Point group: D2
């Protein structure tokens, strides 16, 4: 034989190990329209109608937003927009209510509950009305047969919705 | 009632969805010693003995390297170093061999196989010997009861070892 | 050389592949007490106070129910029971309400919302009162620092509560 | 108000919690052919050629074996069989060797290493030759672009091969 001594500068004692990490994908939508009927005297919504153009999805990532439009997700060619239609608003108090409505994603429709939290009915700058309010709720991908190819392991079945609204009076 | 029109600048149609991502944790060890007996005439290792000071782990992350020393991992107080001892080298050809040896991690010992790939026996700068060679192999955390508290879901049971060596002759 | 022909009866072309499966752990509790104050004239709960003896957990598995009592879960020696105390009941209609209360698990307390669904106020067999009702809600393990050693990957952060009640009048 | 006492027989304090479980999918193949050239005097394989009919997959599950034939897996219509062809056998000793060969799965081909473990060269019942031997190795789904739609989270990238052989002499 023969003996050797390491050269520490060009020797590497290395390892690789695979691990999972859970993370939140958080996105908004840049382009959407709404019809808002709300009566500050009773603090009750009367009509809430929302259309969101899928094309406008923004999850802080160019390449994933594209992939969202594809057939294993939104199918944006065939179904260009998702829609919400209020069917019922059930008042809890002047700050809180349970909003039921029809959500449609990729041409499939389920009724959902959103938690309305009225964040302040004012009469703003110019003496015309403003209102803040939030809508919050969880929906299940499985309920809308969304991304059915993607397992509920890889991507959660649960989608948390957070709609934050400021809104001004008509004309 | 009363009608409102969104202010798009202070309205946000948001969602959150939890997903998993797989990733490789890749680290080395800054401080280790070796005894290397190798016979270039037969290209056979005769003795390979390695001690790696756990304290010197570097996985490009200060806070995780600490956490590696803790009791749910390396137990570096009680077991300050991990060791490899060659028991057998089985030659495939002049470039390749199957090295069997005892690995000890946190005072538990299993025999492993590493794949020796001899990357060039030269006689360098000053007319003294050098050798390159790699040792590659997979070990199972479960075999050494490592991180037993961490599931094989979160962190893989499989650890890939890659030892890259340059090494010079004695005295 | 020499040629051979398989014996198919004692030859096996085999493979192993690791995959994940998501599943629901569903359990009840065999031993618990409650104080129920409810006014059928207004269909409003007035007091709801529940203590559940952790020892009585039943998730259709002997060995896991034990493991639930251990320190990486319930700590049943130190904290023998978990408790719910109603602080608020907010009526939606005669069938529905939003119940807020303090939940304590292993000596940690958070206020929760349960969805009360009144399933029928009758006057039963003997002319004494009965009531059906359900309480439903989701709580987060992280909110109560529960099983903190177990990742939110392996076991979901989300716990769905379903309390199904039948209940009779006093004395 | 009014007070109620639970009826424990028709009251249920329930919970649901989602958790992951890792498990091994283990299958064989019922229908396959082989050409085996082996020289007991030198204990070296000379030729090893295997074709496995995908249709014959058996993973102890009727409905999954079907699903294996589909386009997100084996594509059994277009690619009815997978094949192994030995290109090299490198002897370690009389019991052990490193077999290199071309594996093809769904019309994609990679060279693999299997670990040959010769389990006994005998001359059996009738004075004609038999041989036992195993071939063992890991292959990566990603190397063969297999099940590319299924993530390496849900189903492991790693496939362990275990070929157990008994085999008799010609004619």
């Amino acid at each position: 034989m023969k003996e050797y001594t390491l050269d520490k500068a060009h020797t590497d004692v290395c390892f690789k190990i695979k691990h999972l990490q859970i993370s939140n994908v958080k996105g908004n939508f840049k382009d959407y329209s709404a019809v808002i009927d709300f009566d500050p005297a009773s603090a009750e919504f009367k009509k809430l109608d929302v259309t969101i153009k899928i094309a406008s999805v923004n999850t802080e990532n160019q390449t994933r937003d594209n992939h969202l439009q594809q057939d294993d997700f939104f199918k944006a060619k065939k179904y260009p927009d998702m829609t919400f239609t209020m069917k019922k608003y059930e008042k809890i108090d002047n700050e809180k209510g349970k909003m039921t409505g029809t959500l449609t994603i990729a041409g499939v429709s389920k009724d959902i509950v959103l938690d309305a939290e009225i964040g302040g009915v004012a009469k703003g700058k110019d003496g015309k009305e403003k209102i803040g309010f939030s809508l919050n709720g969880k929906i299940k991908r499985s309920d809308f047969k969304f991304a059915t190819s993607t397992s509920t392991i890889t991507l959660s079945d649960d989608i948390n919705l957070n709609i934050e609204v400021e809104a001004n009076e008509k004309e």
